[PDB]
Write a protein that binds this ligand. Structure first.
Ligand SMILES: [Mg+2]
Ligand SMILES: [Mg+2]
Ligand SMILES: [Mg+2]
Ligand SMILES: [Mg+2]
Ligand SMILES: [Mg+2]
Ligand SMILES: [Mg+2]
Ligand SMILES: [Mg+2]
Ligand SMILES: [Mg+2]
Ligand SMILES: [Mg+2]
Ligand SMILES: [Mg+2]
Ligand SMILES: [Mg+2]
Ligand SMILES: [Mg+2]
Ligand SMILES: [Mg+2]
Ligand SMILES: [Mg+2]
Ligand SMILES: [Mg+2]
Ligand SMILES: [Mg+2]
Ligand SMILES: [Mg+2]
Ligand SMILES: [Mg+2]
Ligand SMILES: [Mg+2]
Ligand SMILES: [Mg+2]
Ligand SMILES: [Mg+2]
Ligand SMILES: [Mg+2]
Ligand SMILES: [Mg+2]
Ligand SMILES: [Mg+2]
Ligand SMILES: [Mg+2]
Ligand SMILES: [Mg+2]
Ligand SMILES: [Mg+2]
Ligand SMILES: [Mg+2]
Ligand SMILES: [Mg+2]
Ligand SMILES: [Mg+2]
Ligand SMILES: [Mg+2]
Ligand SMILES: [Mg+2]
Ligand SMILES: [Mg+2]
Ligand SMILES: [Mg+2]
Ligand SMILES: [Mg+2]
Ligand SMILES: [Mg+2]
Ligand SMILES: [Mg+2]
Ligand SMILES: [Mg+2]
Ligand SMILES: [Mg+2]
Ligand SMILES: [Mg+2]
Ligand SMILES: [Mg+2]
Ligand SMILES: [Mg+2]
Ligand SMILES: [Mg+2]
Ligand SMILES: [Mg+2]
Ligand SMILES: [Mg+2]
Ligand SMILES: [Mg+2]
Ligand SMILES: [Mg+2]
Ligand SMILES: [Mg+2]
Ligand SMILES: [Mg+2]
Ligand SMILES: [Mg+2]
Ligand SMILES: [Mg+2]
Ligand SMILES: [Mg+2]
Ligand SMILES: [Mg+2]
Ligand SMILES: [Mg+2]
Ligand SMILES: [Mg+2]
Ligand SMILES: [Mg+2]
Ligand SMILES: [Mg+2]
Ligand SMILES: [Mg+2]
Ligand SMILES: [Mg+2]
Ligand SMILES: [Mg+2]
Ligand SMILES: [Mg+2]
Ligand SMILES: [Mg+2]
Ligand SMILES: [Mg+2]
Ligand SMILES: [Mg+2]
Ligand SMILES: [Mg+2]
Ligand SMILES: [Mg+2]
Ligand SMILES: [Mg+2]
Ligand SMILES: [Mg+2]
Ligand SMILES: [Mg+2]
Ligand SMILES: [Mg+2]
Ligand SMILES: [Mg+2]
Ligand SMILES: [Mg+2]
Ligand SMILES: [Mg+2]
Ligand SMILES: [Mg+2]
Ligand SMILES: [Mg+2]
Ligand SMILES: [Mg+2]
Ligand SMILES: [Mg+2]
Ligand SMILES: [Mg+2]
Ligand SMILES: [Mg+2]
Ligand SMILES: [Mg+2]
Ligand SMILES: [Mg+2]
Ligand SMILES: [Mg+2]
Lengths: 88, 114, 70, 271, 101
RNA sequence: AAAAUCUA
RNA sequence: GCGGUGAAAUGCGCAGAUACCGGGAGGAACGCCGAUGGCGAAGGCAGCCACCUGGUCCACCCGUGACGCUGAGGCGCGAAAGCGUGGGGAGCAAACCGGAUUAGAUACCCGGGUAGUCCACGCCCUAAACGAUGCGCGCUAGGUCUCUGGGUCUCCUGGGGGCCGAAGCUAACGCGUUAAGCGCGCCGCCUGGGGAGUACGGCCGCAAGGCUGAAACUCAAAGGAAUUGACGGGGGCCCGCACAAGCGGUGG
């Protein structure tokens, strides 16, 4: 799977302060990594579909998080979407 | 082929007929028998009494080659499964040992209509 | 008659080469003996059998041996 | 797979053509000692010996190394994958580090810039080539020889392949593209893998002219002719066969083994 | 990097020279695909249950290496290439579970 | 292996 | 002689079959573990190995701070059978041929046997797609069996799988902390039987055919559970010159 070190390299970057292991953007990026890796996984395992369901659910979850973030404050959203490169 | 004291005896015991055969210790048969060699025809070939007569005839043929001892091996669950053994008891041949070796699949070949 | 577990003390059930331990589980037929006769737990019985199959592949354990006199 | 065409014209709604993706970019063939002139529509006496050949389109014959063993141990770089108007298969320009460039029939799944070699020492792996008695039994193979030191002649067409079933003395057993089983000498060289352009078969010529481009002339039915010119030449109102269907020269077409019986090579075949 | 136990059975009827000969090839493949060896053990000749390659006996090896998770497939394939090599079985190592505590 | 049917 | 069946025949076998041994080819499927068992949203999923990957649960009491639920259309999955292109083909087996049974037998039984069953990619998208029970949360007795996780463990505490059953509900049957109980939120859907999932329109599909979906008309019923009885080539116990064993009769 993904490496713990690789996880920390993300958590440290997206945290608003050290120890923020659960923030909105934190979870969004955290999920986005798995969305990307899983997406690439499907790019060679077209037959697999349950994993693909998991992908759909992950994308959905991320989109809900983006819902709350965009609704609360559009500026932090403005930064996060730009740093994760989504919506297009 | 030739004449030997020790040997083996196979029992092919199906439902519609039970047949048997004697063989050298290696695997190559000496002589054989069935319900048909007793003249019986049809379900009469699967009859346990017919298996008795078949085993007795097979033993009678084996004794001509000088056979005395034989390791026995059985297959199938026909209505004459045990009678082969029973006839081979007082056949005049040394029973020596009895072994089951019914071929059975680990689920692979799809069965017939039944 | 006899429960299989009581025969031996503590041992590795994941180990797939201790043939002297694993052999006492297949009877005079090679049949993977039922849990009600070996007297094991589910978690134990499962990985036991799973390592058993492994041991079968290596040529260590027999797949099916011919039954004796009957 | 194959490229297709929108029906902006009839006889084109079906016409398909292979995607030349595997070709590395090269219109110019290796203009070194590889191209060569080519011709012929009928035998040396001006008579025809094969019906319906002609027209066609000009072709430079690509000289191929079918006898790849004269450079034992010498490796080479898969320089290119080229087209060849003389065979179903694609070809491959390899640069031997010796300096000599040559051609080889392009095997399936052959990356450009691959390591490739020819010798009994060779790693059993796609592209390489070696004596049959060295290839592990049960392996794909193509461009196999026949008699040792006489060049490859078995399985040279697109998608073609043969499998090794077992060894026996100084001979080995092959399952040919015709499904035929056969003994072939152990010393015969052969290249490991399967021939590329597997998607060849799926092409549709689409229209008439496409045949002509390949040189294939129009083929007239025997039953369309006259009794002089052909057996079936009854012709009288789309008449049925005059019994039984047979060639313009006499021999019956459907079911008639033409292989000579007491051929010595018969002692090496099976089915 | 993952802990792996590797079991390899080989031809029971051949000289010691061919034995070490093939062992060498195993070592080669191992180092070639990044298999850093550890507690290796040579179980030696043993009597098999069913006849493998029409032979009731079989020689045994038992490596225990660590390597990147991927090529551990391909490595096995390399071991398959040699004809004299009979059985091959790589197993992902696990904690020795306890029975009859 | 055999027992097909029974006007309103 | 085999094979086969209720008994047989067709079939195969002195051109040497069946049964037995050794050598080899190829395909499909996973015995024992194995279970009232486990997983998944459904369809479904079983030899073992490795890689890749989803969902799920326990502990710590760490982080975010109502970010939740449902969800028309849209989008993806979707057994078997069937369709396309190219493979594969042992076993099984529609269709078809033969044998028997029969008044007939285009069947049940038997001997042969092709698509198909298998892999690659693509289409079809229905089902007794069944718990015939939409989803989410909460409150409402206990007993027992089992899968799994934690904790010093004949006990305590989470998460699934079955039976009996408090209250209560139900037309009865039966459900009942895995509600059909008491409540809320939201989607889907029903309005007598036949006509009919038919017709026309529209959309989809290579075709087969699928999604929406009527009316004229006709009937005075259709239907649900339960009671009673008769009835069964249903079961269990049991009886009578009913059979059997036996003596003489008519039918001539
Ligand atoms: Mg939302
Ligand atoms: Mg755009
Ligand atoms: Mg019979
Ligand atoms: Mg019978
Ligand atoms: Mg009988
Ligand atoms: Mg047999
Ligand atoms: Mg058989
Ligand atoms: Mg059959
Ligand atoms: Mg020149
Ligand atoms: Mg020139
Ligand atoms: Mg001339
Ligand atoms: Mg000339
Ligand atoms: Mg001239
Ligand atoms: Mg010209
Ligand atoms: Mg270059
Ligand atoms: Mg192979
Ligand atoms: Mg031509
Ligand atoms: Mg032509
Ligand atoms: Mg002429
Ligand atoms: Mg003329
Ligand atoms: Mg004519
Ligand atoms: Mg004419
Ligand atoms: Mg004639
Ligand atoms: Mg022929
Ligand atoms: Mg001729
Ligand atoms: Mg000739
Ligand atoms: Mg651990
Ligand atoms: Mg009638
Ligand atoms: Mg009637
Ligand atoms: Mg009536
Ligand atoms: Mg009437
Ligand atoms: Mg006939
Ligand atoms: Mg024979
Ligand atoms: Mg054999
Ligand atoms: Mg033997
Ligand atoms: Mg295979
Ligand atoms: Mg569900
Ligand atoms: Mg749910
Ligand atoms: Mg997981
Ligand atoms: Mg939802
Ligand atoms: Mg189907
Ligand atoms: Mg059709
Ligand atoms: Mg018939
Ligand atoms: Mg009748
Ligand atoms: Mg008839
Ligand atoms: Mg009549
Ligand atoms: Mg008739
Ligand atoms: Mg017909
Ligand atoms: Mg649907
Ligand atoms: Mg329904
Ligand atoms: Mg209904
Ligand atoms: Mg309880
Ligand atoms: Mg515990
Ligand atoms: Mg605790
Ligand atoms: Mg409790
Ligand atoms: Mg608690
Ligand atoms: Mg706790
Ligand atoms: Mg518990
Ligand atoms: Mg219940
Ligand atoms: Mg119930
Ligand atoms: Mg109940
Ligand atoms: Mg009460
Ligand atoms: Mg009340
Ligand atoms: Mg309860
Ligand atoms: Mg109505
Ligand atoms: Mg009606
Ligand atoms: Mg209606
Ligand atoms: Mg319809
Ligand atoms: Mg219509
Ligand atoms: Mg209209
Ligand atoms: Mg319209
Ligand atoms: Mg139809
Ligand atoms: Mg229909
Ligand atoms: Mg209406
Ligand atoms: Mg209307
Ligand atoms: Mg009723
Ligand atoms: Mg009487
Ligand atoms: Mg009397
Ligand atoms: Mg009288
Ligand atoms: Mg009288
Ligand atoms: Mg009278
Ligand atoms: Mg009278």
């Amino acid at each position: 799977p993904i490496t713990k070190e690789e996880k920390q390299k993300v958590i440290q970057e997206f945290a608003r302060f050290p120890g923020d292991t659960g923030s909105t953007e934190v979870q969004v990026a955290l999920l986005t990594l798995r969305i990307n890796r899983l997406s690439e996984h499907l790019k060679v395992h077209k037959k697999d579909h349950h994993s693909h369901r998991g992908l759909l659910m992950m994308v959905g979850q991320r989109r809900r998080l983006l819902r709350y973030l965009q609704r609360e404050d559009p500026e932090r959203y403005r930064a996060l979407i730009e740093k994760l490169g989504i919506r297009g | 082929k030739r004449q030997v004291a020790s040997g083996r005896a196979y029992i092919h015991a199906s439902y519609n007929n039970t047949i048997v055969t004697i063989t050298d210790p290696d695997g190559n048969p000496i002589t054989w028998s069935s319900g048909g060699v007793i003249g019986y025809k049809g379900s009469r070939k699967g009859t346990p009494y017919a298996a008795q007569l078949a085993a007795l005839d097979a033993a009678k043929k084996a004794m001509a080659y000088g056979m005395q001892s034989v390791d026995v091996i059985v297959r199938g669950t026909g209505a004459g499964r045990e009678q082969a053994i029973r006839a081979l008891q007082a056949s005049g041949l040394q029973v020596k040992s009895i072994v089951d070796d019914t071929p059975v699949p680990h689920n692979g070949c799809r069965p017939k209509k039944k | 008659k006899a429960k299989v577990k009581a025969t031996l003390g503590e041992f590795d059930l994941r180990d797939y080469r201790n043939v002297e331990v694993l052999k006492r589980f297949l009877s005079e037929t090679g049949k993977i003996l039922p849990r009600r006769r070996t007297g094991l737990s589910a978690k134990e019985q499962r990985i036991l059998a799973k390592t058993i199959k492994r041991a079968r592949i290596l040529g260590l354990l027999p797949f099916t041996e011919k039954l004796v006199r009957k | 797979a194959v490229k297709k065409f929108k029906p902006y014209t009839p006889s084109r709604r079906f016409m398909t053509v292979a995607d030349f993706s595997e070709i590395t970019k090269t219109e110019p063939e290796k203009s070194l000692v590889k191209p060569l002139k080519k011709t012929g529509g009928r035998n040396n006496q001006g008579r025809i010996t094969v019906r319906f050949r002609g027209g066609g389109h000009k072709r430079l014959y690509r000289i191929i190394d079918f006898k790849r063993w004269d450079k034992v141990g010498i490796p080479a770089k898969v320089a290119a994958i080229e087209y060849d108007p003389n065979r179903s298969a694609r070809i491959a320009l390899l640069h031997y580090v010796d300096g000599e460039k040559r051609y080889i029939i392009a095997p399936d799944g052959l990356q450009v810039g691959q390591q490739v070699v020819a010798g009994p020492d060779a790693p059993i792996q796609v592209g390489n080539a070696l004596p049959l008695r060295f290839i592990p039994v049960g392996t794909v193979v193509h461009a196999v020889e026949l008699e040792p030191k006489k060049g490859a002649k078995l399985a040279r067409a697109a998608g073609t392949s043969a499998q090794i079933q077992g060894r026996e003395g100084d001979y080995v057993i092959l399952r040919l593209p015709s499904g035929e089983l056969r003994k072939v000498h152990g010393e015969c060289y052969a290249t490991v893998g399967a021939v590329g352009n597997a998607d060849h078969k799926n092409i549709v010529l689409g229209k008439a002219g496409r045949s002509r481009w390949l040189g294939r002339r129009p083929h007239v039915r025997g039953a369309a002719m006259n009794p002089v010119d052909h057996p079936h030449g009854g012709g009288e109102g789309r008449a049925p066969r005059g019994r039984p269907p047979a060639s313009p020269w006499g021999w019956q077409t459907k079911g008639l083994k033409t292989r000579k019986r007491r051929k010595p090579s018969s002692r090496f075949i099976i089915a | 990097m993952r802990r792996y136990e590797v079991n390899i059975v080989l031809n029971p009827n051949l000289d010691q020279s061919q034995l070490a000969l093939e062992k060498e090839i195993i070592q080669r493949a191992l180092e070639n695909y990044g298999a850093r060896v550890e507690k290796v053990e040579e179980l030696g000749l043993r009597r098999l249950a069913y006849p493998i390659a029409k032979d009731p006996q079989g020689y045994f090896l038992w490596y225990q290496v660590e390597m990147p998770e991927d090529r551990v497939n391909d490595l096995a394939r390399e071991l398959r290439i040699r004809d004299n090599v009979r059985r091959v079985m790589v197993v992902k190592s696990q904690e020795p579970f306890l029975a009859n505590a």
